[PDB]
Amino acid sequence: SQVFGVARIYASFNDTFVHVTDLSGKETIARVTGGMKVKADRDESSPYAAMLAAQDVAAKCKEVGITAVHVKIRATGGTRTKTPGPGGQAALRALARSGLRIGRIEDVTPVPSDSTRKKGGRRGRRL
Amino acid sequence: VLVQDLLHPTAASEARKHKLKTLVQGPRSYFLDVKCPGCLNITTVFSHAQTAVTCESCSTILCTPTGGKAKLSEGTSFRRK
Amino acid sequence: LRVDEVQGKNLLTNFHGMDFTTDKLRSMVRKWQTLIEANVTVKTSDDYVLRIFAIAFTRKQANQVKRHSYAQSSHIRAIRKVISEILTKEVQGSTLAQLTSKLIPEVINKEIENATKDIFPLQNIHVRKVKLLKQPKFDVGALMALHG
Amino acid sequence: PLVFKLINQPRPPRVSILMFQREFALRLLARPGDSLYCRLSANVQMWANVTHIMKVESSVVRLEIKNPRPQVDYNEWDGLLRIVFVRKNRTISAGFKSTTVMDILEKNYKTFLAMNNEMVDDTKGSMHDVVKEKIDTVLKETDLGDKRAGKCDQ
Amino acid sequence: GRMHSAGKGISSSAIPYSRNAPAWFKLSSESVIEQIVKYARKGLTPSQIGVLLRDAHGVTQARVITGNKIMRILKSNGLAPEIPEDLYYLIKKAVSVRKHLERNRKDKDAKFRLILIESRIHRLARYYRTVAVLPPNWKYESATASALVN
Amino acid sequence: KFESRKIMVPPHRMTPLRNSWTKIYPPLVEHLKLQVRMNLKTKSVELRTNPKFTTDPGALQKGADFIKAFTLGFDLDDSIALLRLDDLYIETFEVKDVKTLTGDHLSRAIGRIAGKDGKTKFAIENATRTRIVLADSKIHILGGFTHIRMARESVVSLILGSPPGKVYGNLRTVASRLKER
RNA sequence: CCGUAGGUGAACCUGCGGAAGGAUCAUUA
């Protein structure tokens, strides 16, 4: 019937990546960062930048003609956190809002069996 | 519980407690007189027989040591004492 | 699934591996039961080298009062012995098409369920994940026979 | 680097009056058997005669550069005292074969033998040779290696 | 109690009240002591004579149907061992764990258990030397312990 | 032009699901105009749409977000706030991600984010427009980025072992220039 | 705070391992 895409959302604390290609990771189709859509450095990972970036990805997918898409979402993984940030959630809201068909929503975050030492030390890392 | 007989307890509650905590210490074991049907002879076996006791003529394991009580052979009769 | 061969803008695709979604594993692990992981190193009848990871568990029975149902370590070693034997003879008695044809109707965990019912009550048994390790000398007619 | 700016300049002055922090003034006046002893103690104690006047906490200290400067290269001496002063409590033999110290030192040695044209063998140090063991041989050849950084003199 | 440990377990043989022979027992004293001596020519230690006597023959204890203990009617025949049973087993256990620790030199727990087992051998050697059923010039050494085992 | 999403039901919250499901479904079915089907056996909820419904593709994502919210401890008034607003999003984070704690250290960190009768939790919902649910090792804050960002600064103060008085002082400082602007 | 190590410092910071002598709300079986 339709053509499904393979979508990736990578949600750090400081940007978001909305990055999609076809099956098996052949050649990347649309590619945005958080920095290119708002030039303010305080708003790299804003949900406004996330929705406008995912809207431009949806425009790219519409002009190449891909309607259905399969998405997996992730954090950095590893020693840092597991579930994605809210920039990924706003990206999901934008891609569903865009009128593009969605196929599957899962969470392929790279999860360790047993991690190594994180980059904070004994005391802690956040503030 | 200010007063109760420690001399004459009720026998339902007396063998109900531990082996060593009775008024006179008694075992809770017995002896089994076992008849395997193949040779028809009386063999007196401990109820907690901790070794592989065979019969004296046939090589039939009458009981195997399994922890507390020794399990007897299947299809084999037994008596108390 | 891995792509190998070209037929005029159409592509033959071969088996490569199986996995679950990670949220299935996140829901699937219970805080009040004992988790068993069993692993076996496999050479197949069709000269593949494979790795099979099977997961078994501990049930509540229909008569339980206990709020937790743990298992002793000798029980766990016995079930892991049984899963290794069932998986080993099952993959040795079959080839790749029969492995895929027994993956879909859950025959293997049914063999686990009725072969381990004498050891412990087991629940939610599936092989989780399939790895290819060695690929043999490349064939042609067997792959189109898999396509045919 | 506070005393480094007035240890190697052209046309050295007559005297040097200045106020610094007091603990650096303890480092310029540290005995070799002290925990206060450092590399800069050696740097003043054979390039710049120094004594303490006018304790102010801060300290005044007086410096004079020796006009007959002794012929010691500052780069190699500074590097060796750095790599034995950072590992102050350690010894000297195993401290050189570190991870990346044991690249940059034989880089310095290969530039040191670039005008000497010494043949680097296939024996080169992992069992008995110049990257691993001839370093131990030449620290055995001098007053260092077993005597630590809080005991060796000039 | 329970020295060289922290357990407080009570798990032991009870004894029945009856100091006389049981009524259902039908075997004679000369028959059971010739049973004891034919089990003694097989070289077993007196705990196993008691256990196989309890299981396959139904004898309650040795002390009731004859007037003696087990080695009273074993040195009456003069088949008593030259060292007592439990001390000999402690030597066997010590040379077994010494074999393990000469195999593996990093096992600290086996070394500390060797210290505990050696303490038990010293205490039992003191007691059995005190009664002088052991000669007074007997001292433990580990090489002579391996000699007495082998 | 149908679309169905599949979502997982926790065992810890299926009894308030069957308790307050009568208050859950008719607001979204009436106002938001969707279709819900259960699978009580397989812990699954079917959120489906139809061309006979209204054309609104983003509210299907919103409905999956309501059930994703209800997955993680969240009550129904925050579902009303998620109905009415759009800037309000969800977060999880782990106790071990800030500081490696074990056992009673974990219990005292959960006590520090909880507080005596939940009062430091009360102080962090009222002064920041956030909503707090504590799991065994997961922290959950709803809201917008200016709100949840100062909630981040407070909670990584508190789970680092800073005393709650400094949390209250920094909390009213950031609340003061929050309501000032 | 304790133990160890280091840069120092007018104070003091940092690396590794421990302790609470520090504040369990809500929810459920």
Added chain:
RNA sequence: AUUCAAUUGUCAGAGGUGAAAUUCUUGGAUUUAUUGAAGACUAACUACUGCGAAAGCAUUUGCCAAGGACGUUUUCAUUAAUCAAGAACGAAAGUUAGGGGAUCGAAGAUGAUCAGAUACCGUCGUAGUCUUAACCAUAAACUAUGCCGACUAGGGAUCGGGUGGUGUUUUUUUAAUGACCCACUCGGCACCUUACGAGAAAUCAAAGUCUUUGGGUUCUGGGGGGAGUAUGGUCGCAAGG
């Protein structure tokens, strides 16, 4: 999983942040996909818990010896309890000499910044972190509670063993077991109520059986500093004990 290498696609960022800033990106960075190599680690399962003298101990399998508990109409017959001298072990960090050195990372090299909400921040990173041979003997090494023995409360549990059930389930045709239930029973980890009793009180099945003062035994304290300092001795390569 992380890091790095090889191959792959594509285009203005990636990085870090109270905030910015450094770092490296037409030789296509971050990221996507196919592999490979390295060394650590053993998450979720994980507590309502287990073992060990303590420190400590979470993948599977095999071997090696060890240990508690229970059962015992076995064996020895006081062989016991506590401990100056002496001895074994002893977290982390440290020390010598090797192998390895992925991540993290005190020193150092670097940038900063802009304010008195403020430097926590970044990037390389040596030592180390890992292992082998030998040292070192300290911790908030904590249950802040010596060890053995007896008595003075129950009950909801649980872990390991045992006993019993015309108890359940698992079928094959009834059993056998395995799992579950009940009534116990010892022996551990813990809980909740009291008060007879203690304490200054918080609180406590021991912190009770102590002015109605004696079951056995080992160590320590005598107002606060000076001070774990001076000095002597002792061990250690030293740091130091």
